[PDB]
Amino acid sequence: EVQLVESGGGLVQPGGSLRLSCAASGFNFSSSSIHWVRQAPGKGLEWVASIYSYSGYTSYADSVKGRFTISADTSKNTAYLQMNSLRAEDTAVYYCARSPWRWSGVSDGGFYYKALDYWGQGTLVTVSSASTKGPSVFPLAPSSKSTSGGTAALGCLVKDYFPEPVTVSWNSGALTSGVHTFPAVLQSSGLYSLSSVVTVPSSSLGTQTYICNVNHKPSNTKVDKKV
Amino acid sequence: RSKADVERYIASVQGSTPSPRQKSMKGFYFAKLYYEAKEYDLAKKYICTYINVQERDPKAHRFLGLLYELEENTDKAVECYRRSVELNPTQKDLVLKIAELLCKNDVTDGRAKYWLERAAKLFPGSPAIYKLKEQLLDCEGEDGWNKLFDLIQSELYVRPDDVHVNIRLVEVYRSTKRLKDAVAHCHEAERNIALRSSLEWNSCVVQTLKEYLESLQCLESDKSDWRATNTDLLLAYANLMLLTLSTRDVQESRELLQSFDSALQSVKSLGGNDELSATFLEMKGHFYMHAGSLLLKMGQHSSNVQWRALSELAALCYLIAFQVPRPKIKLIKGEAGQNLLEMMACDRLSQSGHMLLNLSRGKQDFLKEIVETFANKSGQSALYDALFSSQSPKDTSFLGSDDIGNIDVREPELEDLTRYDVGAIRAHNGSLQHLTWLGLQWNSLPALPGIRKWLKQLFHHLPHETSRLETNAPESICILDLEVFLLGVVYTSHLQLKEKCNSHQPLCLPLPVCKQLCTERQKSWWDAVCTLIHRKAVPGNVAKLRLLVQHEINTLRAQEKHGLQPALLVHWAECLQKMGSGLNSFYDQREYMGRSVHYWKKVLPLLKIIKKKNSIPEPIDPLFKHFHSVDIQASEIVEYEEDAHITFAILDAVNGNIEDAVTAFESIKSVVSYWNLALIFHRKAEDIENDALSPEEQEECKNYLRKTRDYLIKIIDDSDSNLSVVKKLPVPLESVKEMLNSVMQE
Amino acid sequence: DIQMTQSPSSLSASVGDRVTITCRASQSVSSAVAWYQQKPGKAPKLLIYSASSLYSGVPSRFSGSRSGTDFTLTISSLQPEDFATYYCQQSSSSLITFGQGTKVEIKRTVAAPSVFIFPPSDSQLKSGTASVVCLLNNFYPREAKVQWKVDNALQSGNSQESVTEQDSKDSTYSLSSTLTLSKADYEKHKVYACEVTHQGLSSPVTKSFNRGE
């Protein structure tokens, strides 16, 4: 019955602005301290903001000090993280969470929170001046003649797309096992790129038609490619 | 001397020299006696008129400068001395004064330096000369001024609701003469609900705005935003008027009215169809409303003959206000601004509304007479007379020029009034003073206010009842606790005022005029729980605020050592039963009925001891003052035992113990038991009425619907016959008839 | 500034093991530390609060402890559902900081990656770029090092790689290495070799292709 819902994410251009909304329900929002914690891809948790339980004095990490502004509204029973002068470095998954007054203590020189009990689903925020774009699929077939005995390896290269995510399937889901689709990497240009591969018996190569199906929904792109 | 001695001399020389020129040439000698009778808003206008004909008198000019010095208006006082000095150079002491005042107010301008040089050569090396030399040096430098500004801003970041700090920001802006920034912050700050409630802040708002209007910067910049800032002045005046009337004395309130009326006359000429015009509309109503409240304040202290005439006069004022239509909300630029304006509108209609009623309850169609007799333009002059001194020009006074056309002379409807109150709960930041007033105004009416809706408008998403009722920790506060609290605050307040007047009407007092109606204990609690909920507390004071609330919880829930007189508990019990018994949803019904049973279960032990004419153990420093005025008597015990047994049955029914509920309901032939019997017989019928099912059962199902029809008919039959029964109905009569129509068509 | 240094960065264990993770506070910190479990992509969940107090609902096999400025999370008997990343968190004056994190990977026997190199496709050369792909499939452990040779010449700063998470069936990883530069530079060299070093390889192994085959 108690939950936190994050909203107000999405992509934005560097130097722009966004506003996240953390909607709370089930606990008295007045006596709870609200925090925001971002996490870049493959990185750890970074505390970015806090709001003392019953009054709402702000406190930010120096990585975002002066740019972000966190607020709490009793009437709307919702907290927000206003973000300005967004940089590519701020690209990360932003979570919110509460700490009851039972866990919020004030001491000489600042206040402390014992732990973060309730967490949200986490809303994504991408900051990149690269504009939306569909993927270009380049096939990766085996230049092998039964190299690894009875099994060979094929794959597809999904490249020059923005933004995440891309989804891949083989033979429209017929070839489920043996597949390994790797996470994408930010090419210095600004567009992401990944690879998808599968191990299949070499004896069946040339008989069973192998096709990778990629779908980049943010740009309404669909591409099937045989190898 | 007194007020009569000086205002009677008006007719003395008025009958000796009636021409306008000689009438104004006596202004200095008129003002000569008002300065002695402690009238400075009046003496100011008297001398100022003599200055309009005798503009070359150095004595008169200095006298006004010395009077503006008492008013602490440095810019105005200095200029007056300047005129007297340039007319007559021999006034050395004024050259010192000018130099003395220029260095104390602001040194940034070289004008303070110049006048100091002259002051030196007029008084060679006098003790004051060095004193001024040190004063001029005192003021900080550019780095120093910027240094102070950063403190205030850094201080305002974490303390935006601090009255003093925000005031200092306006003073710092004004010291650097960047008044545009002063008003800019002043405007963005009139959206703060707390600052808007600060008497001293609004006073600063009136000045910083006026200073900007006359300021050279206002004209040079543009005439486009001129209207925007002008609106805030009117808004500030309304807020300032509300506060001055309550705290300040009779004299100060009247003086503020004149500034209000001057602004209105200066604004009406522009008109138009934008925020300013709409603002003028709503503020116009406030003017009369407060003016009516102001009128009633004077009459309270005065004799009976003046009271009736003044209350008659006030009744017209409130009427004028109520008539004024709801302002055009769509026409404002922003959501915050428009919502504010409506909030004030609701406040106007609510406050004026109850007053209109309380004054009209005195006699039969008393309102009609008020309009038929004083709606005449003769009343307009009788109003200006009682409020102001007739000497002021009646041409530029908005009061004397308003077109009083077609006064509705229609008493207000309760249903409209309720929605006005509910919409205006946030008008005065929900001060327990505000609510305790409203709650008392409805205490004399036959329809009760939607208190639970008031609290929902203030503390949003605060649960009706907290799951963790076991402890008294104030994180478990519930809208029920508050509703139970306000009930006692008003039940207590009413009894206290009843005792006061008995030693010496109580309903008739307007909201500003009356003093604190609750105990400082109660007020401290409400202010605490409010600051806590809205998240405007202080990290350090959190634990103290938290404990202050916790202390009283055990009393609002009738736990260990509750300072509750049995009568107050009973009042809580029935007031929640009937409050809940009219609700539609089950969640709310259950909660309100639960609490009602709870309080009942705590009283009945007391009633039994009282039933045998024994003594109740009186409390130790109770939260809600005990009174023998309402001490329970044996004559009423059996009724409560019966009325309580109903509340028990109702909860049994809501929980599922229909067998025990019906057995009890049927035992007592009460109007309320019919509506309950009917409502539960209808449910057993409707569900089973149309599904495929055993025919014998279907006949039994219909049989219940037949009982429903009969009980509703018994209600209406007994209702139409006697009025006392109409008031006992747990729901409105039309609601009972509404069900019956559907019951029979089924 | 206070810092929570978490160790180890990556841990490998099997079911039933008594596992230990530790965080050191630079300055002397009071018992206001917490522990969290974050499964891949999901939200972080609270395990221990106030250093050694168990959060209601957490299994009893979790326990927190402190010694000096070193805080330690202890799992008495590891379970399959506990194979996730963990974080330590301190709350000092008006500031919260987290450890770098600790990934608990399922331990298994060693496996050698079956490598397959792939050339850039005709379609990609049409665009004007050239990407070489080097697969490392179903190996263990995560640690490995790949190097690129253009005509037996080391390359760095122009290629990248990414690794899959530990598979659910065999508990093995996979790596895709991409060497990206212009077609012009790709047509300037003939031989291309991808070398791999790994604990499972008896000796380093390399596979290569020549433009045109």
mmCIF file of C-alpha atoms in Angstrom, chain C:
data_model
loop_
_atom_site.group_PDB
_atom_site.id
_atom_site.type_symbol
_atom_site.label_atom_id
_atom_site.label_comp_id
_atom_site.label_asym_id
_atom_site.label_seq_id
_atom_site.Cartn_x
_atom_site.Cartn_y
_atom_site.Cartn_z
ATOM 1 C CA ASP C 1 35.478 14.895 3.080
ATOM 2 C CA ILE C 2 34.577 11.467 4.466
ATOM 3 C CA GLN C 3 35.109 8.431 2.225
ATOM 4 C CA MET C 4 33.790 4.858 2.473
ATOM 5 C CA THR C 5 36.337 2.537 0.856
ATOM 6 C CA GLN C 6 34.654 -0.791 0.095
ATOM 7 C CA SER C 7 36.639 -4.009 -0.316
ATOM 8 C CA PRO C 8 36.742 -6.297 -2.190
ATOM 9 C CA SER C 9 35.502 -4.707 -5.415
ATOM 10 C CA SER C 10 34.493 -8.053 -6.960
ATOM 11 C CA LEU C 11 34.053 -11.284 -5.000
ATOM 12 C CA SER C 12 33.527 -14.844 -6.235
ATOM 13 C CA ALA C 13 31.950 -17.529 -4.047
ATOM 14 C CA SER C 14 29.545 -20.481 -4.130
ATOM 15 C CA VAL C 15 26.423 -21.397 -2.175
ATOM 16 C CA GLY C 16 26.659 -22.000 1.575
ATOM 17 C CA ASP C 17 29.842 -19.940 2.002
ATOM 18 C CA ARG C 18 30.255 -17.494 4.876
ATOM 19 C CA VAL C 19 30.881 -14.284 2.944
ATOM 20 C CA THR C 20 32.300 -11.007 4.230
ATOM 21 C CA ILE C 21 32.402 -7.469 2.832
ATOM 22 C CA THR C 22 34.088 -4.546 4.558
ATOM 23 C CA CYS C 23 34.004 -0.749 4.376
ATOM 24 C CA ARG C 24 36.452 1.647 6.028
ATOM 25 C CA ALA C 25 35.552 5.187 7.051
ATOM 26 C CA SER C 26 38.383 7.668 6.558
ATOM 27 C CA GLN C 27 37.441 9.789 9.570
ATOM 28 C CA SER C 28 36.094 8.469 12.855
ATOM 29 C CA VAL C 29 32.381 7.951 12.177
ATOM 30 C CA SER C 30 29.562 7.082 14.567
ATOM 31 C CA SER C 31 27.282 4.063 14.136
ATOM 32 C CA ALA C 32 25.137 5.580 11.385
ATOM 33 C CA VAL C 33 26.067 3.184 8.589
ATOM 34 C CA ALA C 34 23.750 1.107 6.415
ATOM 35 C CA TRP C 35 23.922 -1.733 3.894
ATOM 36 C CA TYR C 36 21.984 -2.282 0.676
ATOM 37 C CA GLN C 37 21.385 -5.039 -1.867
ATOM 38 C CA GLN C 38 20.886 -4.011 -5.503
ATOM 39 C CA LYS C 39 20.020 -6.656 -8.066
ATOM 40 C CA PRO C 40 20.816 -5.899 -11.734
ATOM 41 C CA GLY C 41 18.577 -3.083 -12.953
ATOM 42 C CA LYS C 42 16.228 -3.242 -9.965
ATOM 43 C CA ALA C 43 16.049 -0.864 -7.035
ATOM 44 C CA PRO C 44 18.361 -1.022 -3.992
ATOM 45 C CA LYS C 45 16.871 -2.688 -0.912
ATOM 46 C CA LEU C 46 17.822 -2.064 2.715
ATOM 47 C CA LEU C 47 19.498 -4.932 4.596
ATOM 48 C CA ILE C 48 21.059 -3.460 7.766
ATOM 49 C CA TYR C 49 20.617 -0.076 9.450
ATOM 50 C CA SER C 50 22.488 1.631 12.292
ATOM 51 C CA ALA C 51 25.501 -0.606 11.672
ATOM 52 C CA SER C 52 24.222 -3.824 13.303
ATOM 53 C CA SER C 53 20.403 -3.598 13.347
ATOM 54 C CA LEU C 54 18.501 -5.809 10.897
ATOM 55 C CA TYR C 55 15.822 -4.198 8.752
ATOM 56 C CA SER C 56 12.399 -5.743 9.323
ATOM 57 C CA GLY C 57 11.800 -8.455 6.736
ATOM 58 C CA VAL C 58 15.464 -9.204 5.946
ATOM 59 C CA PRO C 59 16.533 -12.868 6.326
ATOM 60 C CA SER C 60 18.312 -13.724 9.566
ATOM 61 C CA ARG C 61 21.494 -14.846 7.768
ATOM 62 C CA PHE C 62 22.488 -11.183 7.307
ATOM 63 C CA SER C 63 24.360 -9.400 10.091
ATOM 64 C CA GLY C 64 26.283 -6.138 10.348
ATOM 65 C CA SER C 65 29.256 -5.382 12.566
ATOM 66 C CA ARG C 66 31.810 -2.648 13.205
ATOM 67 C CA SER C 67 35.405 -2.574 14.453
ATOM 68 C CA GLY C 68 37.122 0.794 14.814
ATOM 69 C CA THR C 69 36.315 2.605 11.567
ATOM 70 C CA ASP C 70 35.796 -0.647 9.606
ATOM 71 C CA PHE C 71 32.210 -1.798 9.073
ATOM 72 C CA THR C 72 31.488 -5.323 7.909
ATOM 73 C CA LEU C 73 28.518 -7.118 6.378
ATOM 74 C CA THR C 74 28.358 -10.831 7.185
ATOM 75 C CA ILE C 75 26.234 -13.544 5.549
ATOM 76 C CA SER C 76 26.277 -16.748 7.594
ATOM 77 C CA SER C 77 25.186 -19.101 4.773
ATOM 78 C CA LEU C 78 25.060 -17.739 1.226
ATOM 79 C CA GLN C 79 21.976 -18.580 -0.843
ATOM 80 C CA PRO C 80 21.357 -18.557 -4.617
ATOM 81 C CA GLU C 81 19.104 -15.493 -4.341
ATOM 82 C CA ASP C 82 21.876 -13.499 -2.619
ATOM 83 C CA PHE C 83 24.126 -13.309 -5.716
ATOM 84 C CA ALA C 84 23.883 -9.567 -6.315
ATOM 85 C CA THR C 85 25.787 -6.323 -5.764
ATOM 86 C CA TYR C 86 26.062 -4.763 -2.301
ATOM 87 C CA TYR C 87 26.777 -1.215 -1.126
ATOM 88 C CA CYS C 88 27.759 0.406 2.170
ATOM 89 C CA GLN C 89 26.499 3.857 3.111
ATOM 90 C CA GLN C 90 27.514 6.383 5.761
ATOM 91 C CA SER C 91 25.462 9.373 6.897
ATOM 92 C CA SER C 92 27.678 12.138 8.250
ATOM 93 C CA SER C 93 26.686 15.748 8.884
ATOM 94 C CA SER C 94 24.361 16.798 6.031
ATOM 95 C CA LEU C 95 26.026 14.346 3.653
ATOM 96 C CA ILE C 96 25.627 10.733 2.512
ATOM 97 C CA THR C 97 28.283 8.687 0.705
ATOM 98 C CA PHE C 98 28.280 5.137 -0.678
ATOM 99 C CA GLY C 99 31.001 2.575 -1.180
ATOM 100 C CA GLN C 100 32.207 1.592 -4.629
ATOM 101 C CA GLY C 101 30.128 -1.595 -4.375
ATOM 102 C CA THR C 102 30.833 -5.320 -4.235
ATOM 103 C CA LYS C 103 29.615 -7.824 -6.818
ATOM 104 C CA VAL C 104 29.084 -11.401 -5.608
ATOM 105 C CA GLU C 105 29.669 -13.647 -8.624
ATOM 106 C CA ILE C 106 28.882 -17.362 -8.565
ATOM 107 C CA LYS C 107 32.092 -19.378 -8.506
ATOM 108 C CA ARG C 108 32.661 -22.275 -10.894
ATOM 109 C CA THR C 109 35.468 -24.124 -12.631
ATOM 110 C CA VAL C 110 37.605 -22.415 -15.256
ATOM 111 C CA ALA C 111 36.544 -22.268 -18.899
ATOM 112 C CA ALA C 112 38.510 -21.252 -21.983
ATOM 113 C CA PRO C 113 36.901 -18.676 -24.316
ATOM 114 C CA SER C 114 36.170 -19.922 -27.822
ATOM 115 C CA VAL C 115 37.316 -16.943 -29.887
ATOM 116 C CA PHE C 116 36.089 -16.000 -33.357
ATOM 117 C CA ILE C 117 37.258 -12.916 -35.235
ATOM 118 C CA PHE C 118 34.969 -11.220 -37.764
ATOM 119 C CA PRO C 119 35.868 -8.681 -40.456
ATOM 120 C CA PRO C 120 33.969 -5.498 -41.289
ATOM 121 C CA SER C 121 31.087 -6.124 -43.638
ATOM 122 C CA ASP C 122 30.790 -4.886 -47.205
ATOM 123 C CA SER C 123 27.847 -2.727 -46.115
ATOM 124 C CA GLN C 124 29.924 -0.999 -43.424
ATOM 125 C CA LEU C 125 32.786 -0.262 -45.827
ATOM 126 C CA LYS C 126 30.134 1.408 -47.990
ATOM 127 C CA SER C 127 29.435 3.826 -45.125
ATOM 128 C CA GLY C 128 33.122 4.715 -44.710
ATOM 129 C CA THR C 129 34.029 3.049 -41.389
ATOM 130 C CA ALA C 130 35.626 -0.274 -40.450
ATOM 131 C CA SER C 131 34.868 -2.207 -37.252
ATOM 132 C CA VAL C 132 36.588 -5.491 -36.362
ATOM 133 C CA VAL C 133 34.837 -7.783 -33.875
ATOM 134 C CA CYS C 134 36.529 -10.314 -31.580
ATOM 135 C CA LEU C 135 34.332 -12.720 -29.621
ATOM 136 C CA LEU C 136 35.205 -14.360 -26.307
ATOM 137 C CA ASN C 137 32.403 -16.836 -25.613
ATOM 138 C CA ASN C 138 31.359 -18.696 -22.458
ATOM 139 C CA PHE C 139 34.489 -18.431 -20.330
ATOM 140 C CA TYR C 140 35.294 -18.020 -16.639
ATOM 141 C CA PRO C 141 36.435 -15.921 -14.743
ATOM 142 C CA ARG C 142 35.529 -12.366 -15.707
ATOM 143 C CA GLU C 143 39.187 -11.346 -15.782
ATOM 144 C CA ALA C 144 40.713 -11.308 -19.264
ATOM 145 C CA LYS C 145 42.832 -9.083 -21.502
ATOM 146 C CA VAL C 146 42.515 -8.643 -25.272
ATOM 147 C CA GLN C 147 44.993 -6.858 -27.544
ATOM 148 C CA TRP C 148 44.754 -5.776 -31.176
ATOM 149 C CA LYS C 149 47.443 -6.126 -33.857
ATOM 150 C CA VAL C 150 47.306 -4.320 -37.208
ATOM 151 C CA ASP C 151 50.080 -5.952 -39.251
ATOM 152 C CA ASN C 152 51.558 -7.111 -35.922
ATOM 153 C CA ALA C 153 51.396 -3.565 -34.500
ATOM 154 C CA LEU C 154 49.817 -2.848 -31.117
ATOM 155 C CA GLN C 155 46.753 -0.602 -31.042
ATOM 156 C CA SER C 156 45.245 1.263 -28.106
ATOM 157 C CA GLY C 157 42.876 4.167 -27.578
ATOM 158 C CA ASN C 158 40.796 3.231 -30.639
ATOM 159 C CA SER C 159 39.002 0.028 -29.565
ATOM 160 C CA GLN C 160 36.503 -0.870 -26.854
ATOM 161 C CA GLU C 161 34.873 -3.943 -25.356
ATOM 162 C CA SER C 162 31.891 -4.993 -23.265
ATOM 163 C CA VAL C 163 31.144 -8.092 -21.204
ATOM 164 C CA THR C 164 27.913 -9.942 -20.511
ATOM 165 C CA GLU C 165 26.741 -10.642 -16.996
ATOM 166 C CA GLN C 166 27.293 -14.121 -15.577
ATOM 167 C CA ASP C 167 25.024 -16.454 -17.532
ATOM 168 C CA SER C 168 22.311 -18.315 -15.633
ATOM 169 C CA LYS C 169 22.816 -21.776 -17.160
ATOM 170 C CA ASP C 170 26.601 -22.263 -17.110
ATOM 171 C CA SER C 171 27.716 -19.192 -15.104
ATOM 172 C CA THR C 172 30.032 -18.035 -17.903
ATOM 173 C CA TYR C 173 30.759 -14.611 -19.370
ATOM 174 C CA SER C 174 31.256 -13.328 -22.897
ATOM 175 C CA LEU C 175 33.156 -10.362 -24.324
ATOM 176 C CA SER C 176 32.848 -8.410 -27.574
ATOM 177 C CA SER C 177 35.832 -6.287 -28.617
ATOM 178 C CA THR C 178 35.394 -3.646 -31.325
ATOM 179 C CA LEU C 179 38.294 -2.027 -33.204
ATOM 180 C CA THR C 180 36.866 0.975 -35.068
ATOM 181 C CA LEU C 181 38.664 3.272 -37.509
ATOM 182 C CA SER C 182 38.186 4.615 -41.017
ATOM 183 C CA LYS C 183 38.015 2.491 -44.157
ATOM 184 C CA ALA C 184 41.016 4.468 -45.431
ATOM 185 C CA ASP C 185 43.166 3.157 -42.578
ATOM 186 C CA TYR C 186 41.574 -0.294 -42.908
ATOM 187 C CA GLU C 187 42.587 -0.491 -46.581
ATOM 188 C CA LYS C 188 46.134 0.525 -45.547
ATOM 189 C CA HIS C 189 46.821 -2.743 -43.680
ATOM 190 C CA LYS C 190 46.350 -6.391 -44.659
ATOM 191 C CA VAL C 191 46.851 -8.551 -41.540
ATOM 192 C CA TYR C 192 44.637 -8.268 -38.453
ATOM 193 C CA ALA C 193 45.115 -10.305 -35.269
ATOM 194 C CA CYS C 194 43.164 -10.479 -31.995
ATOM 195 C CA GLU C 195 45.160 -11.897 -29.069
ATOM 196 C CA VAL C 196 43.589 -13.167 -25.845
ATOM 197 C CA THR C 197 45.154 -13.882 -22.450
ATOM 198 C CA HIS C 198 43.207 -15.793 -19.823
ATOM 199 C CA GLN C 199 43.735 -18.042 -16.816
ATOM 200 C CA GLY C 200 41.906 -20.810 -18.697
ATOM 201 C CA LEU C 201 44.250 -20.632 -21.685
ATOM 202 C CA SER C 202 47.300 -22.870 -21.369
ATOM 203 C CA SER C 203 49.108 -20.174 -23.362
ATOM 204 C CA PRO C 204 47.908 -16.986 -25.077
ATOM 205 C CA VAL C 205 45.965 -17.692 -28.273
ATOM 206 C CA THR C 206 45.399 -15.530 -31.342
ATOM 207 C CA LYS C 207 43.142 -15.652 -34.396
ATOM 208 C CA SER C 208 43.542 -13.425 -37.439
ATOM 209 C CA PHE C 209 42.240 -12.625 -40.917
ATOM 210 C CA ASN C 210 43.667 -11.009 -44.053
ATOM 211 C CA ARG C 211 41.701 -8.400 -46.000
ATOM 212 C CA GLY C 212 40.291 -10.351 -48.934
ATOM 213 C CA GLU C 213 40.851 -13.712 -47.207
#
